[PDB]
Subunit: 233 residues, 4 copies
């Protein structure tokens, strides 16, 4: 059993497991059933930006996703992540397709963790994903293509997405997401993405997630489960 915290860019409504009946952004604390969601107008073929922000003093996990034309969606959830995650974690990106499909392309990814100037800190930014990105752990169908972009889920040589794909990219170094001696733990994550499908109803979405160090893809996690959970509890 992996422990999971995640911000989800859910493009396909699986209303049976709690989804609203539209594309949406959500905050997932140890369950695919988001503790809080917001309506999200996904824009086929456009490059969006997700910003995730957490603060251990305020104990609020906040996320906003937006597109160059302005359209944004925002969700927030009161949660003390020091009561959820282990001391050391890995951070990652995941994505899935199912019966409906889409590109799950990452163009850039940034993360910053700070423990507080006796500050422990970790920060990375990736704007070009080389073929052998030695500081990323790729799982499932995730690969890096010839444009220097990360393809979380399978895409054909044409460029057309495929269904029933799962893929995840984890940063190589573990993250001291909190330590006992800290008065301020905090982190911020940013990624830009390109989701494009022929489907007038694409699937399934992208997430940013935090998990225990040794986390691999749970069996039975494609489509609605976003490569994060074994079931829908």
């Amino acid at each position: 059993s992996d422990t999971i915290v995640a911000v989800e860019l859910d493009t396909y409504p699986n209303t049976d497991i709690g989804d609203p009946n539209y594309p949406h952004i959500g905050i997932d604390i140890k369950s695919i059933r988001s503790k809080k969601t917001a309506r999200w107008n996904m824009q086929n073929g456009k490059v969006g930006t997700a910003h995730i922000i957490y603060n251990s003093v305020g104990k609020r996990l906040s996320a906003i996703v937006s597109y160059p034309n302005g359209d944004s969606a925002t969700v927030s959830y009161d949660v003390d992540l020091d009561n959820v995650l282990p001391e050391w974690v890995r951070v990652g990106l995941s994505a899935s397709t199912g019966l409906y499909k889409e590109t799950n392309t990452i163009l850039s990814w940034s993360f910053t963790s700070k423990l507080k100037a006796e500050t422990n800190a970790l920060h990375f930014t990736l704007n070009q994903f080389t073929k052998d990105q030695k500081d990323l752990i790729l799982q499932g169908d995730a690969t890096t293509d010839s444009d220097g972009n990360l393809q979380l889920t399978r895409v054909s040589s044409n460029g057309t997405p495929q269904g029933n794909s799962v893929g995840r990219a984890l940063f190589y170094a573990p993250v001291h997401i909190w330590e006992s001696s800290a008065v301020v733990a905090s982190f911020d994550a940013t990624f830009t993405f390109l989701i494009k499908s022929p489907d007038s109803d694409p699937a399934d979405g992208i997430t940013f997630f935090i998990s225990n160090m040794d986390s691999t893809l749970p069996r039975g996690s494609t489509g609605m489960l976003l490569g994060l959970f074994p079931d829908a509890n």
Copy 2:
């Protein structure tokens, strides 16, 4: 009428104007009557650290003050500061003494503002306050001493604090604390301080504050009013 947002390190309980009956940290939104407070054990003669954190997605102003031995106090307040402050501001530090006194010594001050990589951003750190600090606006009794520390309120050549003192230090450049085109505005401030008095009941406290650009010290603002407000409304 200046517009003021402030985190206050209130060392003296003025219970008539809403104070708890102990030293405390508070969040002040356009009034000395803190919207939220927390018990704070001030430690005479020790160097404390204040950390202030705000996020426009979460709309939570959080603050924590602590000492090297660990003792911390934390307060948070839900407020959308985009609905309170003007677009351009100055950030500052203030402090007062009244009938009871204390040193209000600043040893270091950091600020970071980010508008979101089309990011407008401003960040400064001051660990030594030279005699003519050309990037600080000093108001009232504030001066910089021979140890490279900032003395917000008057201290004699001996080193003994004086009463009925007011002093403020504002950063020279205005701060674009938000702009309309932003999806993420956020800021963080940090300062270390040394509060020392012969009084078994020192007064009055230090604040970090944000205000309109042309803000000067309001008349009638010493002691309990912390150099921020003209009255106690």
Copy 3:
């Protein structure tokens, strides 16, 4: 007499005052006659990036300018800037036109100064130049337009550049570019620009510069003198 250090993007060869017979990048230490230059292929209508880097341990001022297609020009000069500049400075951007013209448009500007975690530090990034940018000091013809870009030299409502223009933009807060107690002083500057002319031989260029605090535009400084020097000595 202002004291000036500058990296120059010289688009027009004024061979009489030391220029090479091509567009070039140069390092200017208290004289328009660059201490060191490099050939630069300016690309009409494209957005370039200039990166300026200095280190007080290595005592090397380095600059590189480049375009999205890759073409770059690099120049370096051994100089101890602690022996040239005053303790407190302002940093800026300037540009000129003369008999030949060009747009001198700034789209983004970043600066970072660090004195060394007892670090004094100042850092700003400007990606949108609002109409009233309260943290920039505009001089001469410099204004901000309706696209959120900074126009160092005059451009007509059409968008066509004009000749005999001078303009400079200085950051509002002075910069502690060095202090005596430092073991490491260092700074880095970045700006992106758009230079466009109908002229098959545009003029005159853009610079990033450091100067004394009270520096205004010297008389007789347009065209080849880049708004920095009173003469060509």
Copy 4:
């Protein structure tokens, strides 16, 4: 054969292999015989700071080490590190004792790498070394003690250093120290250390180093060879 670039804090003069006849700081490019050295007054029992700075435009590797009382030593060497190191590396700290001994205690370590806002970047800061620091690779005698400090070489429960010790600490994630598409590669490293011996002539020193990813401690590298080289060529 590992490829090695290193800044060395050489406390013991091994004059047979090129050392000056005093403690010194040096720049080591693929050989223990420093390309450039500087006199260094090591201060027994005091906490020093080393700052290492490199820039791909200036192609100068610079280093400065200093103590709270001010005494500093500075060395610089013109070298294009893009012509020396592989694309992906690990960064580390090493230290040795031999016939003479000393503590080789690291209290803090920071590193920052930037490829240039299409910036790839990696940055970490470690101010407390927990018992199981999951983001450090420890080699040889390196361990973390009960004060949250890293002990590169063996120290007894008393706190007394031991001779013939070797130890290295490498950051877990590889570092894209340069990529072909970059116009600016650069990095900066900082570490604070405590070197203390009963010996009026302690040995051997601490280094910061960059090496190929799979680098382990070369056989025959203790004492004068600083855990970096197999021989003295």
